[model samples]
Target: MLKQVEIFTDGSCLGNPGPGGYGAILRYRGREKTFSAGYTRTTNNRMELMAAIVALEALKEHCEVILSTDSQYVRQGITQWIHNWKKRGWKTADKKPVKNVDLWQRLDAALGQHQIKWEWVKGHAGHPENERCDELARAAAMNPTLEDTGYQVEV
Candidate 1:
């Protein structure tokens, strides 16, 4: 038997490569949990990857999960492109090295340990959990007091 879990994740950066934050909402077994984290400096993609990673990491080991996100990079990378990149030693078709390979590798490892399904949704299109995560991410990015939620994984 598989335990079913659903997660929504979002990331925000005040400036292109500035203060960033990540947020996620996880639901399972009639329970829901929310998480958010902020960084002093980072890129939007980094925050996006971080949000998904943190949400997946929060699940119990080997739990079946349905993860949703509004990020194309996150969704398409994991669902459509990661395997080829991995086969090519993490290089793109053009032989260019993949950006955020570290996070991608970590995400791949975490994902490999579980049963997961990835879904992509449009951001700010009135999806409740996605909207809530966006709110949490933006709030964390704008407010100093709420900055402790983010994890600083040296990248």
Candidate 2:
């Protein structure tokens, strides 16, 4: 039997290129895991990508993962466009270089190690896990009290 996993992720920045954070909630076989972290300097998009990367990295091994996020960048990149981007050396269709190539690369690698289904959820929607992740992300971005709780792994 295949192991099934689900993850909901979100990211926020207090200001453009300002303090930022990413949050992720992972569920697998009746186990729940919450993860979040803040960065002193980062953009919302980067944080969004980081959340997916961190969540997938937390998996113990290759598994069937359903990853959900509110960011079009994350959803579209992985589900609709990454193949072409990778073929073109990570450049956009218009030949412009990808903005967050590093994070994208990291996410791509993590994704390569698993069977993942990418999903997009409407932000501020009534989805419970999505709301929780958004709350955790925004709180980390706006509040000064939340500690950085991300896991670091060397690529």
Candidate 3:
């Protein structure tokens, strides 16, 4: 039997390519699991992707997931853009190398194991779970100690 899980996630960056963090809350029945981590160098987009990726990857079994995030980039990229990206050999429509291919691939793999419903929530608008995730992410970002291993120096 597949379990149903609810997840809320958010990401933060002190600068576009500076200290960053990702946070997530996973709830199943009455129990909850929360996670957050910070990186010394990363981008908001990467952090956002990390939030969802980490949350999904944490599950030990197949589940039905309702994942909520404030980022349209993540939701749309996964639900819509990924199909064309895959068909085009991971290139964008203009055939440019897709940015953040590493995280995208990781997210794609995580997607394969679960049935997920993507939800877009407005940020900083008093949504309890989203706000809590925002707080976690921001707090992590402010005190990052780990290096973001995959961070590439873009020209």
Candidate 4:
């Protein structure tokens, strides 16, 4: 039987460019593992992407994964925007560059190694895992500084 996994992730930021953090949880074969880290300064979207990236990257082998998130930006970017962004050399519709491309690229690369299904949920809507992720994320953001450098296009 294929190893099927379920991942639930979330990101937290005190301010748009303030302290940030990400949380990821994975369930497989009746076992669960969680991960989280904080950043000195970052955006919620970046942290959101990082959550998925870290979770997928943590896997030692490829498998079918159901990635769940409360962030539409993260979910849609990979499933939809990524194609056009790649075709345009990682630029947006107005020919402007894409922000958080670094994490997006990383997420995309990790995604290639597995069969993934991206699911979107409403934040603070009483989802248990997402709530745990939110708690972890907020706490992580309160941790000491961890840097991601200036935000720029992937290219």
- Relative to the true structure, candidate 3 reaches a TM of 0.93
Tens-digit per-residue lDDT, 1-155, candidate 2 = 56889999999888676778888999987789998877766778878988888999998788999888889877777767789888998888788877677778888899998887867776736888988988888877865344333322212
Worst 10 residues of 4 by lDDT: 146-155
Global lDDT of each candidate: 0.80, 0.80, 0.88, 0.84
- The residue pairs found clashing in candidate 3 are none
TM-scores of all models? Answer: 0.85, 0.83, 0.93, 0.90
RMSD (Å) per prediction: 3.8, 5.1, 1.5, 2.8
Candidate 2 structure, TM-score to reference: 0.83
What candidate 3 gets wrong by more than 4 Å, as runs, is: 94-96
* lDDT digits (tens) for residues 28-112 of candidate 3: 9969888899998899999999999999999999999998899877977977879988899999878887888889999999988
lDDT of 1 by residue, 19-135 (tens): 878889989976999998787777678878888888888866788888888897787787677988878999887888677787888888878877888777876459988999988
Which residues of candidate 1, in runs, are more than 4 Å off?
93-96, 144-155
Which one wins by lDDT: 2 or 3?
A: 3
Q: Which stretches of candidate 4 lie over 4 Å from their true place?
A: 93-96, 150-155
lDDT of 4 by residue, 1-40 (tens): 4589999999999987888899989988778898999988
TM-score winner between candidates 1 and 2 = 1
Could you tell me the lDDT of residue 85 within candidate 4? 81
